[PDB]
C-alpha cells in the first residue's frame, strides 16, 4: 500500500512546472544574475545615501 | 532586490530537479505498472477466496 | 569571488539533493531484492533445466 504514485505525480507536476519556468524565464534569470546588485541601488536613492 | 535575490535562489533548485522529470517519468510509469499488478492480485486474491 | 559564487551555486544543489537520501534509500532495498529474485529463479531455473 506504498500508494507513492501520487507522490511521485506531485513531484512531477513540481519539476515540470519548474522547467516550464525554466524556458518561460531563463534568459531572463541569466541576464540578471551578473548585475542584481544594481537592484539594491535606486537612482534618487542614491543622492539619498 | 530581494525578489530578484528569492529568485535567483529558488531557479538554481528550479534547474536542478527540473532534469529529474524524465526518471521521475519511467518512475512512476515502473510504479503505476506495480500498482496495477497489486489491484490485479488482490482483485484475485478476493476472487479466489470464495 | 569566482570559487565563492560557485560554492553558493553549490550549496542549493548540494541541499535539495541530499534531501534525496532516504527515499532512495528504500529503492535501493527493493532493487536488492529484486536482483535477489532474479538469481534465485535463474539458479531454480538452472537445477531443474538439468
Known amino acids: 500500500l506504498i500508494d507513492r504514485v501520487e507522490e511521485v505525480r506531485e513531484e512531477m507536476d513540481e519539476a515540470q512546472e519548474a522547467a516550464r519556468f525554466l524556458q518561460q524565464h531563463g534568459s531572463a534569470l541569466t541576464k540578471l544574475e551578473p548585475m542584481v546588485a544594481v537592484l539594491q541601488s535606486d537612482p534618487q536613492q542614491h543622492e539619498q545615501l | ?50
Open chain 2, 1 to 50: 532586490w530581494q525578489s530578484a535575490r528569492e529568485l535567483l535562489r529558488d531557479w538554481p533548485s528550479q534547474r536542478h530537479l527540473a532534469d529529474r522529470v524524465q526518471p521521475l517519468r519511467m518512475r512512476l510509469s515502473e510504479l503505476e505498472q506495480r500498482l496495477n499488478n497489486q489491484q490485479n492480485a488482490e482483485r484475485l486474491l478476493s476472487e479466489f477466496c470464495k
